[PDB]
Symmetry: D2
Subunit: 319 residues, 4 copies
């Protein structure tokens, strides 16, 4: 029994048979799936790329139960997980160039497949988890952690520089942990989440309600090298745009709004604006290595029965 979406904007229905795996495929008993905004947003079905009934979740981890034909590397019982990436075309320039996250023919778990008691995934797109970190602990890495690490690595930032993380959400606190493990200096925007970040290794904290972030960073850091925007809102977007020094990189981690962007201030200051959706297998494995090295989350455990309500809570903003 699993939760499935029959129709969009309609509550998920709770028994389906666990299908047999074909050649080069894997059936994995789910131990803990993670909740993403991608999940809710797929559930509403309001996206240009729309997902027949299917099962959400791209953040599932567990034990290997069934292997397909031709499986030689993954053994039955390995602690592994299934990321947003289900499968790529392996033929496009992105795929063949270690940029498979941009494959046009990518199949995404929970969208183009039945995402995360047993889930089927291709053996070459599953992540080997560390042998000493609980499955609930590795859960946010399948989407949040790896996207953060991909953005941070895409912020063209050398160790020992300054980076802003706008909005300390789940992605926020993972981003702080990772940047500190990457050997950078960090700054962010709830005063309690600020305090949590300061305890996490944030060298600077600033509430945008109390004071102005741009002037502060311009009088203390002289502009930051990178800005990782977890919570993309117009206010935090202008703030990010301003908080960066000349030539710095603003990384974006997906509301449907068209945001005004000054073509003057950027060209003058040479600010580069990147966007990062999810990391690759390599990124995923490194993020897992950083988690297993104990350098990196705080999540709340819930039951399948409470899945629908959680989505409602997500719409209310109480999370």
């Amino acid at each position: 029994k699993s939760a499935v979406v029959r129709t969009f904007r309609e509550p998920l229905v709770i028994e389906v048979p666990v299908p047999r795996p074909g050649p080069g495929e894997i059936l994995v008993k789910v131990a803990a799936s993670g909740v993403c905004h991608t999940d809710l947003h797929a559930a509403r079905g309001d996206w240009p790329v729309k997902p027949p009934p299917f099962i959400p979740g791209h953040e599932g981890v567990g034990h290997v139960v069934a292997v397909g034909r031709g499986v030689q590397h993954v053994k039955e019982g390995d602690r592994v997980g299934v990321p947003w990436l289900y499968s790529t075309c392996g033929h496009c320039e992105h795929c063949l160039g270690g940029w498979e996250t941009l494959c046009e023919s990518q199949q995404n778990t929970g969208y183009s497949v039945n995402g995360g008691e047993y889930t089927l995934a291709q053996a070459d797109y599953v992540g080997k988890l560390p042998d000493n970190v609980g499955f609930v602990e590795i859960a946010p890495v399948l989407c949040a952690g790896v996207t953060v690490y991909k953005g941070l690595k895409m912020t063209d930032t050398r160790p020992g520089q300054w980076v802003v993380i706008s909005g300390i959400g789940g992605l926020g606190h993972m981003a702080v942990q990772y940047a500190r493990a990457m050997g950078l200096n960090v700054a962010a925007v709830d005063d309690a989440k600020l305090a949590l970040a300061e305890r996490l290794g944030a060298t600077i904290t600033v509430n945008a309600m109390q004071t102005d972030p741009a002037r502060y960073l311009k009088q203390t850091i002289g502009g930051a090298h990178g800005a990782l925007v977890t919570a993309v809102s117009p206010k935090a977007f202008e703030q990010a745009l301003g908080m960066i020094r000349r030539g710095g990189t603003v990384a974006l981690n997906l509301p449907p709004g068209d945001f005004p962007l000054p073509i003057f201030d950027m060209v003058l200051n040479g600010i580069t604006v990147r966007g990062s959706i999810v990391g690759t297998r390599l990124d995923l494995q490194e993020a897992l290595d950083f988690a297993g090295e104990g350098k990196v989350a705080t999540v709340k455990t819930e039951k399948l029965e409470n899945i629908n309500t959680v989505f409602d809570q997500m719409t209310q903003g109480h999370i």
Copy 2:
């Protein structure tokens, strides 16, 4: 010596005789032979910016002969063919300066803006040694146009053998085509004037497309499958959305300065992982562009004018019929 100056903003420049000052330590006085015209010049004359400049001698695109050297000058001799770029001087202390990114120096002094024809003074370490075989009018438009284009191409993270679009073949457009072809790339032209399109095809453009006749985004997505880089010379909302759409997943938009806040759908960018970025290049950039011009791989097409008809030229710029260079000879 008589020179044109801005007495007041939005007011025609007065041609008034001005004294040629004496160069101090580390300064050089240079006979101007030909200055080049940028939209930066007109826009500085109107002074319509939070960073406003009076009275100031315009032009950041002047070239000529070394006449007077300062005290302590050892490398540049009296009589060298040199030019003076948009960069007049930097602070040499900020991390941009010390990191070979001096074009981003907070305390940069800009020629024709923060400083002042016939004879101009410049700091000896911010002047570009031009090639000894290319005419002064020919190398003149590179000081801003050429080097900014070359810095944008270098800023597009594009390896040789890939595809790049040039939205609007202006002066900067044809300079960009020449430079990208000398860089060993594949190019496309979105200029809306079929005659400029034909000129680009004659320059080495593998693809040409008028945005009025057909849609560029679908065309490039059905032929090239999206381009790796997009260098926007003429930044307009129409050319901006088409530029955004012309890029393949993971590509870079290079922008070369309208006062509008442009809407951008951040969903399509983050989803496709598109990167959006070069006002002027550094000394290195300038020298490299000059080497490419002296190798005859980049030849510009300019219109020569007299100093007296400057205001008329600005009027033409505002009128939109317009690269132009003034010839002292």
Copy 3:
């Protein structure tokens, strides 16, 4: 069932014999027209490398028409004009594999060494490690790119050189490809080949500077004209050309080495560490190969080869150890 030449024993002639043409799941067998001749091929016959093959077919440079598809192959169609590179297959699991650096996979299978080569008219290869050739360039024309061309393109890409800089090529067949490739990449190039017949050919290919190491000194010349080069792609790796290449590079420049001689070469870190010289690789990845293929199909790269028959293969190897060979050779299947 046809006739093919194979290695029975090392330093012993490849004998021809009819072999059964074996098409596994997710594998592809293609009738080959391109035979590949490389130095790497010959030394597998000598087997002098510590990593030696288990007998029995050489050649990692075969191209032709797709004949047989495996089970589950959906991208490659029967009749596609394709080729098979030095890379037969990787483990697809190591960090090199997972990071688009599959040329460094520990568990790589190489064609002509760990598997059967393109010496037979028909060879089997994994569908995800074959190169789709251009639709307008002859099989004989694209054939030497499968190893020479792509190693060159990977070396140039590994010389950390921005277009409009200077690069030296120390110019055989591999060298002669390298010149074309660098000019199409938009660089300024120089030739340290010591043969004026090859030197003039390089000047005809687009080499801006040429210098014979017997007549004059290259290091002093380049330090008095270019002031040292940014990169040096060494095709023919010999101690003399090694010292020369090292000296010809400017401060901070990159030394590219392509050959594989069995010598331990003296190199003083005084010269390198003082000048900050970086010394770097051969055989590119799938992306690299495809790039070289695009460069050839754009007509910017055109090899010069001599066509031979399969039967004379040992003769060719013999001539190769004799040193009278200069310029790549592709045996025909017409």
Copy 4:
């Protein structure tokens, strides 16, 4: 102020003469700085022997690792104030015109003037644009070992093309070794120490070295190929043929070998294993001003702290002999 007694090289392979010398007056764009503590490098000794083809012109006062107070400013000096805590690096001056200079690669300027070689190093004169602003909370003796050792280390690490979270070997734990460990751990890497001295190895393990290995007791290459599967980078401080072969072997396919020392040997290179494995071998002597300032930021961040012994100028000459004996831990000359 006044004028003061200083140690100088009269002739090569001959002990330094301690004799009173003038404090020269700084011209336009020049600076006179009170010396508070200089650091001792192998570059100094090797310049004293003068055994390099690039030989200096005697007399010349060695030491490229001096820090202290700004005393006199030149004409046109506007950024550095009289009394700033600054230091003078191996780099005295560049030509500011060559492509290396113009491109923020001034460390390779053909016309570079080096302190302690082409110029001298109680008071030293230096160019105002090639001096390092020290952190405002670190003693002079503490920042002294960074001027050549630390910044060359940080430049080598930056020259090892290593992303954070990878593995790097440090061959030989000298002064530069322990500085390298400190920097790599502050850079967020995983480290290994092939120091053969088990006690300095233990110090490295105390510094944050995840792995330690004595090459006398065990084989390093086999160990790293069975534990890490080869390291991404190898920073060689103490360059000897044995540790050179070891470094070459310790790296995984495609890794980068960084070299710090400068022995006069011509070293064999088996380019077959390198070409096979695609190994890159880069040489790196010193960082630039940017590098230097960053290393100082890391020291002022309290993330880097060297261990040095303070000695007197009178026994500096003796120290040279101690180094030739190999009984030498970084050494700093105090002037309290």
